[PDB]
Amino acid sequence: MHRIWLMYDPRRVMVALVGFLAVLALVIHFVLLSSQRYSWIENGTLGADQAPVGASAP
Amino acid sequence: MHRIWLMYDPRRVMVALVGFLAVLALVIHFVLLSSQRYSWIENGTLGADQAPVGASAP
Amino acid sequence: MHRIWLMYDPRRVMVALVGFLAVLALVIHFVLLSSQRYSWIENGTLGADQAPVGASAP
Amino acid sequence: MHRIWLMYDPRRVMVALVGFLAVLALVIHFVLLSSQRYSWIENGTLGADQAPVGASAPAA
Amino acid sequence: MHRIWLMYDPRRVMVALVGFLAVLALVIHFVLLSSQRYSWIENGTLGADQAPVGASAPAA
Amino acid sequence: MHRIWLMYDPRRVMVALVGFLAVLALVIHFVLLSSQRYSWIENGTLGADQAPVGAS
Amino acid sequence: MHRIWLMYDPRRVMVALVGFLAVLALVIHFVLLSSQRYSWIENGTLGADQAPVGASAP
Amino acid sequence: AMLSFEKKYRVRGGTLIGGDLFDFWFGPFYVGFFGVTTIFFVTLGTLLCVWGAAMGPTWNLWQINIAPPDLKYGLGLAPLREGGLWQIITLCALGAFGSWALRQAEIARKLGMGMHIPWAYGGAILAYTTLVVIRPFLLGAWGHGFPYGIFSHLDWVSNVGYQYLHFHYNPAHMIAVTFFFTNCLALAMHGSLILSVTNPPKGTPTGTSEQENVFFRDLLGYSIGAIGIHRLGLFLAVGAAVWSAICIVISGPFWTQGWPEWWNWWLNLPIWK
Amino acid sequence: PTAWPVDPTTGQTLINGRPVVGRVFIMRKTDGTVKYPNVADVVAHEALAPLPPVV
Amino acid sequence: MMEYIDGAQIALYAFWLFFFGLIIYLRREDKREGYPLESPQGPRDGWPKGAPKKTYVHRDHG
Amino acid sequence: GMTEEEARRFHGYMVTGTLGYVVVASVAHFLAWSWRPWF
Amino acid sequence: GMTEEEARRFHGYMVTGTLGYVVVASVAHFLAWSWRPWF
Amino acid sequence: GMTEEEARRFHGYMVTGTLGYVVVASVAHFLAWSWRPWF
Amino acid sequence: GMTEEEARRFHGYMVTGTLGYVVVASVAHFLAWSWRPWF
Amino acid sequence: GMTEEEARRFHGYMVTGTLGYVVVASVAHFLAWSWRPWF
Amino acid sequence: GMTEEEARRFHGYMVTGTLGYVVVASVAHFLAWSWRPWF
Amino acid sequence: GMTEEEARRFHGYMVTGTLGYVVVASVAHFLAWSWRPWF
Amino acid sequence: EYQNLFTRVQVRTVPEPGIPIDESTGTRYGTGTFSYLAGKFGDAQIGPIYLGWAGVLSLIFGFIAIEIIGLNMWASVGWDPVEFIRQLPWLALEPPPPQYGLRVPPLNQGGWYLMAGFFLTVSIILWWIRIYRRARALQMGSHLPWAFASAIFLYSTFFFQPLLVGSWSEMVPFGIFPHLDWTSAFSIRYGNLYYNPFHALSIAFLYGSAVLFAMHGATILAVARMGGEREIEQITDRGTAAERSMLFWRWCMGFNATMESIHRWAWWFAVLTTFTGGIGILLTGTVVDNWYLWGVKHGLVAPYPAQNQLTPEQQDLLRGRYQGTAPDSFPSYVV
Ligand SMILES: CCCCCCCCCCCCCC(=O)OC[C@H](COP(=O)(O)OCC(O)COP(=O)(O)OC[C@@H](COC(=O)CCCCCCCCCCCCC)OC(=O)CCCCCCCCCCCCC)OC(=O)CCCCCCCCCCCCC
Ligand SMILES: CCCCCCCCCCCCCC(=O)OC[C@H](COP(=O)(O)OCC(O)COP(=O)(O)OC[C@@H](COC(=O)CCCCCCCCCCCCC)OC(=O)CCCCCCCCCCCCC)OC(=O)CCCCCCCCCCCCC
Ligand code: BCL
Ligand SMILES: CC[C@H]1c2cc3[nH]c4c(c3C)C(=O)[C@H](C(=O)OC)c4c3nc(cc4[nH]c(cc(n2)[C@@H]1C)c(C(C)=O)c4C)[C@@H](C)[C@@H]3CCC(=O)OC/C=C(\C)CCC[C@H](C)CCC[C@H](C)CCCC(C)C
Ligand SMILES: *[C@H]1O[C@H](CO)[C@@H](O[C@@H]2O[C@@H](C)[C@H](O)[C@@H](O)[C@H]2O)[C@H](O)[C@@H]1O[C@H]1O[C@H](C(=O)O)[C@@H](O[C@H]2O[C@H](CO)[C@@H](O)[C@H](O)[C@H]2NC(C)=O)[C@H](OC(C)=O)[C@H]1OC(C)=O
Ligand SMILES: COC(C)(C)C/C=C/C(C)=C/C=C/C(C=O)=C/C=C/C(C)=C/C=C/C=C(C)/C=C/C=C(\C)CC/C=C(C)/C=C/C=C(\C)C(=O)O
Ligand SMILES: COC(C)(C)C/C=C/C(C)=C/C=C/C(C=O)=C/C=C/C(C)=C/C=C/C=C(C)/C=C/C=C(\C)CC/C=C(C)/C=C/C=C(\C)C(=O)O
Ligand SMILES: COC(C)(C)C/C=C/C(C)=C/C=C/C(C=O)=C/C=C/C(C)=C/C=C/C=C(C)/C=C/C=C(\C)CC/C=C(C)/C=C/C=C(\C)C(=O)O
Ligand SMILES: COC(C)(C)C/C=C/C(C)=C/C=C/C(C)=C/C=C/C(C)=C/C=C\C=C(C)\C=C\C=C(C)\C=C\C=C(C)\C=C\CC(C)(C)OC
Ligand SMILES: CCCCCCCCCCCCO[C@@H]1O[C@H](CO)[C@@H](O[C@H]2O[C@H](CO)[C@@H](O)[C@H](O)[C@H]2O)[C@H](O)[C@H]1O
Ligand SMILES: [Fe+3]
């Protein structure tokens, strides 16, 4: 499978990968931090039974 | 079928395809995370019969 | 009608067709998703008689 | 009639024609979809006797 | 493992690393200082039994 | 660690470091200066038991 | 320590220093003049007991 | 990658600060010391904007709104939730825009070009600096800056305009608008003329400076010439931004009534008082 | 239902029947803002529609 | 009738489709000089692929 | 460009394809009319 | 540029891909129809 | 560009990777359907 | 461009780092799940 | 450029500096967790 | 650039300026702590 | 340009002037503290 | 370093251009001349103009339009020549009253307005034809008349949108401050034009036109010492001035135009300013009547905390009426 590194220069792929994973990681953390349930800075010490849950159907 | 790779440089198509799938996956996830029924971060622990449903005809 | 591929470069036509189908499918899906009757992410689980319908003549 | 293709390059015309037809088709569909009578996505299941009709002469 | 430095110039990988860490460190501090629980300049002397905890409304 | 200066010729980067430190010090002072607890220009004389705490 | 002047042109350093200190002095005076406690052009004659103080902890 | 003629031009030299240390490229981009500082301020400022969105009511791109502090905080830094985050982002934006201008100077110096581009961009930086620094400082509170939000800043523009009842009557605003409209006209004329001599009808030779000067002459009655139209375009576009900065800095710090009643001086000239 | 129950024996807040260590506050987004649901909801908060003109 | 879709929204997406088509056209035009790009991995076009380099015919004078 | 011999056969395809499209559209209008007449 | 042979060979794949696409679309429409018909 | 033999080698990887990805996505949809069906 | 020996040598490190990263992420998810499960 | 011996020498410093920095960060988190834990 | 013996000599001063600066800062922090603790 | 001797001479002045400035500024702070102390 | 902002040495030529390129029908009007002041900033020749049939008629039709406007403005201050100059920016020729709809109104109540609008419109169309014929006579592309057609399109929407809503009263008054009063009241009537997305787009291209001309003006001046202002030769015979211009922007922002294609970016940004503008006007009052509420529906509008809250009886009390007719009497209140 290594011949993928003949089609693509590893120096370029690792730059693309580090860029992609940096953006994706920051996206997910900020999305969670914006939520009610996973606003862990304000509420991280609540237990699972105490954490918010989004409104159910009637 | 393989002659398609004589029409198009596979190095270029693979870059195009990964670009398309990345955008498409992010769009689908954000559509679902905008919704009521699939706001899984806030309500993902609800059972399938507790999850929101849009209105019926009266 | 194969002389159309002498008339037009198939590499350009096939990219044109892919772009056309991509745009058209996205348009139709988003039109339906913005309707009431076919807002399937919120209401896809409703039965066919429970799905919304627009008003009749009085 | 075929000498029209000597005046006009068919490679330009077919593109211009496809463009016109695609625009025209989309224009007509969206004009109908915006109407009351033919908003078929929301009301397409209504029978022809119960689809909307614009109001007749008001005897004003 | 050390041949990463034949692929990339260490003089500028170190610049990009230090800059990333400085940006990251400043972000996390400004994020914490924005919070109520960790607004340490105004409330850092509160003991953990007095520190804020966020909850959802009960809405019973 | 002295070999760092063979990567980064100091005459080209001391004004960088000093510029970084001067701005960072100014930011920290201005952050403190307009907090309630550390607005020392207006309230520096109070003493610790009288100084504000931003409790909820 | 004097070999620092073999790295940097004193003609430029002395200008950069005097500029910096002039800006810094002007800022600190403006910060004090904009305060309540040290707005000395209006309240400078007040005794140190009479000068304003910010609010205590309630 | 490089343009087919590019490699010859990629020499060292022309930097302002870093010397050879940062004197390199990353893909197409020149880096340099101000490239490094640019990316620092861009990344910090962007991630703080994303944090502002996270702690706000929605992720909808149009509705995100990072607002300045209340006016009661004056020239202090407010609590970060309360506008201090806007104040930090404003410092990053100043740092980024300044870094971008100085990086352009390093690039112009390396290519042996004149410094026109860095200075022309200074006209935009001036206008931004007026809106968020100079005008708020003269009014005595950072809370007078505009909010960072794609539509919420348009709500700010609307309300600032009606703070003077009928902002169209602002005389510097009339000049600024005239420059923006004249610029867009001149851009269309210059773009059209060059394309019309380089893309004449099929079976026609490529045109010449003489033809575009002849056409331009019977459009405006005079021929501006090749250097003249570029001087004019620079004058109009940058002059619009400078008159924009004037029109907003006079509104509030120097004039407080409605703008229509500013014109009372014209009615009272003694030849017709 | 604007605040969670308090344990009288400690002053400690009880969330879902169980104590929390700390001062509980109800979380909200910046300044309590909430995105507008609908035109119908925005209009429901306004005055009624104006009466017809006198001509 | 369609509640959400309206003629201003339709017209706006018609413009977006045109505008992205225009940007593609302009980027093809931007690549008539200096392309294909030199790189260590051989020639590179970016995207979209540039239009060909254009020859100009001068006049025979009078 | 093209010769008249080429224009001759292109016209044959062009006329045929046009008529086929008009035929398919004729069925679509037949179906649309049967569902919901506009007059 | 294609030879007419390459054109005629490519056309066979293009017709086949179109057919496969229309088949999938036809199944998809009939799944959609039986879940929530639009007429 | 590629020889036809290189194009044939790449096609093997491309088809296998495409079908592999669709299988992984098929399990993702199986899991998602069992958690919260959308019809 | 790399020798195939160099591609072989790089691929070993690339797989090993990817595996390591996936392990750390898998532990991180199970800690997050134990503290506050999202389903 | 730099030789494999230079790369290897630099790598040893670089790994050590990273691990030392990570150790210092670990103690900072130990202190912060003692002051005000976040879970 | 400079030689290693220059770099060692410069490093000796730079380290000592760093320690001097940190000492002044350490006294400044302990004065501030004495005046108004932040934990 | 500069020399060890030239640098030493300038350094003597630069150090002396800096320290002289800081001395005068310390007397201004003494006067300001006597007038209206800030802690 | 020389900035190339003004010309310290001009040169005269005693014979001159201004005698046109070979042009056929019509006549070259006047003799060429030099302005030393024009020569400081640009090319010095101020000189002969071409009209032809379409240019002559355009000036006749346009002059009448200007006369009708000015005479009505002057009549509106009772023929006072002092008040005509003193009050000039507040004067208008004003569109018809709303109750007429599209019917012909009285002469002093908008009849002169529609006449001036008609002759101005004919004059603008005849000027477009004059430009189109001149571009072809000089053997040029048609880029300039189509750019001018974009401006004419926006202008025509100040006729078609009043037509579509059904009243000439909605048209723009001829007058300096009065047309700005209309511009504000249009945004008020239709519920804040900032939320019209084509207005937002039109601004994006108006600003972008300034961005591009600032960038392009500066770029060419920055390479003018290397002949970069000889743009046609830099297009046909690329020199180092073009290469440096491409490399500057490539190294700055990661991509670049060419010496030709930057003029296409320029052309489309200017043209799209008025084209998107016209679409936004045509949609206003015909498809959308309150753009802020369209913004709320489509999620444009950022939320703010409520500044007031109405009770239900206030909701009935605080509704007004839509504005009606003015009182056509002077009531006595004595009993
Ligand atoms: C968005 C905002 C609005 C702004 C919005 C607009 C944004 C505009 C920017 C858009 C992206 C532009 C990208 C670009 O131009 O790239 C040029 C480059 C050049 O290709 P090349 O010339 O052929 O190859 C270069 C390479 O061979 C040699 O690179 P060099 O040696 O010169 O430089 C090294 C790099 C970074 O090095 C690395 O990343 C690798 C480090 C080792 C990784 C080891 C594995 C780690 C595993 C984890 C272990 C973990 C445990 C140990 O950096 C430099 O030194 C150059 C200077 C950088 C700039 C200065 C930075 C200053 C400090 C501040 C930094 C702050 C933080 C960024 O191209 C490539 O490498 C290939 C393409 C790379 C794509 C990168 C972007 C991908 C983003 C994907 C996001 C997708 C979202 C949907
Ligand atoms: C409403 C009125 C609007 C009014 C304002 C409208 C503004 C319009 C102008 C801006 C857009 C054009 C930007 C551009 O062309 O940059 C050159 C770049 C690559 O150049 P290349 O010559 O084709 O290829 C170079 C490559 O072969 C060799 O380079 P190297 O090996 O050294 O480095 C590697 C490359 C890898 O590429 C990338 O990383 C792409 C980065 C992102 C591309 C743009 C994505 C969309 C916009 C940004 C979204 C993310 C933004 C946060 O690294 C580079 O080449 C980096 C240099 C390019 C940096 C471009 C930065 C543009 C930022 C635009 C910001 C727009 C803000 C609205 O091009 C591309 O990557 C493809 C661009 C295709 C046209 C864009 C429009 C597409 C419309 C949608 C069609 C269907 C999907 C494509
Ligand atoms: C000229 C070469 C030296 C010098 C040589 C001496 C000598 C010799 C003596 C002092 C002494 C003192 N110096 Mg010393 N001093 C210098 C620079 C300084 C600087 C400075 C910012 O650079 C400062 C703040 C001081 C400060 C001081 C005081 C701690 C002290 C006496 C009080 C004083 O301030 O007098 C005011 C002085 C100044 C503000 C600046 C210097 C002015 C002139 C050049 C020296 C005046 C000396 C004074 C008249 C004493 C005479 C002693 C008899 C000759 C025996 N000096 C220069 C660099 N200094 C005396 C001491 O140790 O007392 C305890 C002492 O005998
Ligand atoms: C792409 C959008 C931009 C745009 C573009 C644009 N405008 C253009 C063009 C272009 C590309 C032209 O080619 C065209 C032009 O000619 O430019 C010089 C024009 C034009 N843009 C104009 C104006 C204009 N453009 C504006 C805006 C814009 N123009 C947009 C920003 C505005 C604004 C912002 O409000 C204005 C006011 C004109 C200067 C010109 C069109 C001139 C025209 O049509 O004139 C008609 C004639 C008259 C009104 C009559 C004049 C009467 C004389 C004073 C009478 C003298 C007596 C006479 C001799 C009597 C007759 C006797 C006979 C026997 C001779
Ligand atoms: C003069 O007449 C005009 C026209 O009616 C009045 O203006 C009306 O009211 C305004 C709200 C509106 O802007 C305008 O369009 C118009 O509708 C104006 O105020 C004056 O009113 C007095 O005269 C009225 C009149 O029409 O002559 C009179 O109206 C009443 O009497 C007439 C018969 O004389 C009858 O036809 C009307 O139906 C009747 N209307 C009402 C409401 O009573 C006004 O009398 C009263 C009580 O309103 C006069 O008003 C006064 C105070 O004298
Ligand atoms: C909010 O919810 C939303 C976000 C919307 C939901 C959606 C989410 C979506 C769509 C997510 C998609 C995620 C994804 C998709 O694939 C994620 C894919 C992730 C992947 C693949 C990660 C891979 C990481 C690999 C790493 C870390 C490798 C490290 C390698 C190292 C350390 C060795 C380097 C080489 C060396 C040292 C050799 C030198 C020797 C040399 C050179 C020699 O010797 O020659
Ligand atoms: C709000 O919450 C949000 C923010 C959203 C939550 C999310 C946060 C996220 C996603 C965080 C991610 C963090 C992360 C991810 O990887 C973090 C990764 C961090 C890393 C890798 C740190 C590495 C540091 C390394 C250092 C310090 C090295 C120092 C080296 C030194 C000192 C020696 C240099 C060598 C010399 C001097 C020798 C020269 C000799 C020479 C030349 C010779 O001899 O030749
Ligand atoms: C919410 O956010 C907020 C509120 C902001 C919170 C978060 C804050 C954060 C994250 C802060 C981080 C701070 C930080 C991180 O590293 C801070 C790091 C600080 C550092 C490194 C300080 C180092 C200082 C070193 C100095 C002064 C050295 C001076 C040396 C001198 C004078 C000698 C010069 C040489 C000579 C004389 C010899 C010439 C001889 C020659 C030439 C010869 O002999 O040849
Ligand atoms: C003796 O000569 C004197 C001294 C009087 C000459 C001096 C004159 C002066 C001083 C003139 C001053 C003029 C000024 C200051 C004018 C200001 C004009 C401005 C600022 C105008 C701004 C906007 C106007 C717009 C947008 C108007 C648009 C009008 C349109 C599109 C009208 C179209 C009308 C049509 C097509 C009419 C058709 C006729 C039919 C019968 C079909 O009716 C509908
Ligand atoms: C679901 C829809 C179902 C109905 C669709 C019907 C579409 C029409 C199908 C017609 C099939 C036969 O169509 C016929 O093909 C032949 C051979 O290709 C074309 O023949 C064409 O090319 C040949 C040479 O190749 C010329 O000699 C001839 O003059 C020219 O017309 C005809 O122009 C066309 O009439
Ligand atoms: Fe130009």
From TrEMBL, chains D, E:
<dbReference type="GO" id="GO:0019866">
    <property type="term" value="C:organelle inner membrane"/>
</dbReference>
<feature type="transmembrane region" description="Helical">
    <location>
        <begin position="12"/>
        <end position="32"/>
    </location>
</feature>
<keyword id="KW-1133">Transmembrane helix</keyword>
<feature type="binding site">
    <location>
        <position position="29"/>
    </location>
    <ligand>
        <name>bacteriochlorophyll a 1</name>
    </ligand>
</feature>
<dbReference type="GO" id="GO:0042314">
    <property type="term" value="F:bacteriochlorophyll binding"/>
</dbReference>
<comment type="function">
    <text>Antenna complexes are light-harvesting systems, which transfer the excitation energy to the reaction centers.</text>
</comment>
<keyword id="KW-0437">Light-harvesting polypeptide</keyword>
<keyword id="KW-0148">Chlorophyll</keyword>
<keyword id="KW-0812">Transmembrane</keyword>
<feature type="binding site">
    <location>
        <position position="40"/>
    </location>
    <ligand>
        <name>bacteriochlorophyll a 2</name>
    </ligand>
</feature>
<feature type="binding site">
    <location>
        <position position="29"/>
    </location>
    <ligand>
        <name>bacteriochlorophyll a 2</name>
    </ligand>
</feature>
<keyword id="KW-0479">Metal-binding</keyword>
From TrEMBL, chain H:
<keyword id="KW-0602">Photosynthesis</keyword>
<keyword id="KW-0408">Iron</keyword>
<dbReference type="InterPro" id="IPR036854">
    <property type="entry name" value="Photo_II_D1/D2_sf"/>
</dbReference>
<feature type="binding site">
    <location>
        <position position="190"/>
    </location>
    <ligand>
        <name>Fe(3+)</name>
    </ligand>
</feature>
<keyword id="KW-1133">Transmembrane helix</keyword>
<keyword id="KW-0674">Reaction center</keyword>
<keyword id="KW-0148">Chlorophyll</keyword>
<keyword id="KW-0813">Transport</keyword>
<comment type="function">
    <text>The reaction center is a membrane-bound complex that mediates the initial photochemical event in the electron transfer process of photosynthesis.</text>
</comment>
<keyword id="KW-0076">Bacteriochlorophyll</keyword>
<feature type="binding site">
    <location>
        <position position="104"/>
    </location>
    <ligand>
        <name>bacteriopheophytin a</name>
    </ligand>
</feature>
<dbReference type="InterPro" id="IPR055265">
    <property type="entry name" value="Photo_RC_L/M_CS"/>
</dbReference>
UniProtKB/TrEMBL annotation, chain J:
<feature type="domain" description="Photosynthetic reaction centre H subunit N-terminal">
    <location>
        <begin position="2"/>
        <end position="62"/>
    </location>
</feature>
<protein>
    <recommendedName>
        <fullName>Photosynthetic reaction centre H subunit N-terminal domain-containing protein</fullName>
    </recommendedName>
</protein>
<feature type="transmembrane region" description="Helical">
    <location>
        <begin position="6"/>
        <end position="26"/>
    </location>
</feature>
<dbReference type="Pfam" id="PF03967">
    <property type="entry name" value="PRCH"/>
</dbReference>
<dbReference type="InterPro" id="IPR037097">
    <property type="entry name" value="Photo_RC_H_N_sf"/>
</dbReference>
<feature type="modified residue" description="N-formylmethionine">
    <location>
        <position position="1"/>
    </location>
</feature>
<keyword id="KW-1133">Transmembrane helix</keyword>
<feature type="region of interest" description="Disordered">
    <location>
        <begin position="34"/>
        <end position="62"/>
    </location>
</feature>
<keyword id="KW-0472">Membrane</keyword>
<dbReference type="GO" id="GO:0030077">
    <property type="term" value="C:plasma membrane light-harvesting complex"/>
</dbReference>
<dbReference type="InterPro" id="IPR015810">
    <property type="entry name" value="Photo_RC_H_N"/>
</dbReference>
<dbReference type="GO" id="GO:0019684">
    <property type="term" value="P:photosynthesis, light reaction"/>
</dbReference>
Automatic annotation (TrEMBL), chains K, L, M, N, O, P, Q:
<feature type="binding site" description="axial binding residue">
    <location>
        <position position="11"/>
    </location>
    <ligand>
        <name>a bacteriochlorophyll</name>
    </ligand>
</feature>
<feature type="domain" description="Antenna complex alpha/beta subunit">
    <location>
        <begin position="5"/>
        <end position="39"/>
    </location>
</feature>
<keyword id="KW-0042">Antenna complex</keyword>
<feature type="binding site">
    <location>
        <position position="21"/>
    </location>
    <ligand>
        <name>bacteriochlorophyll a</name>
    </ligand>
</feature>
<dbReference type="InterPro" id="IPR035889">
    <property type="entry name" value="Light-harvesting_complex"/>
</dbReference>
<comment type="function">
    <text>Antenna complexes are light-harvesting systems, which transfer the excitation energy to the reaction centers.</text>
</comment>
<dbReference type="GO" id="GO:0005886">
    <property type="term" value="C:plasma membrane"/>
</dbReference>
<keyword id="KW-1003">Cell membrane</keyword>
<dbReference type="Pfam" id="PF00556">
    <property type="entry name" value="LHC"/>
</dbReference>
<keyword id="KW-0076">Bacteriochlorophyll</keyword>
<protein>
    <submittedName>
        <fullName>Light-harvesting protein B:885 subunit beta</fullName>
    </submittedName>
</protein>
<dbReference type="GO" id="GO:0030077">
    <property type="term" value="C:plasma membrane light-harvesting complex"/>
</dbReference>
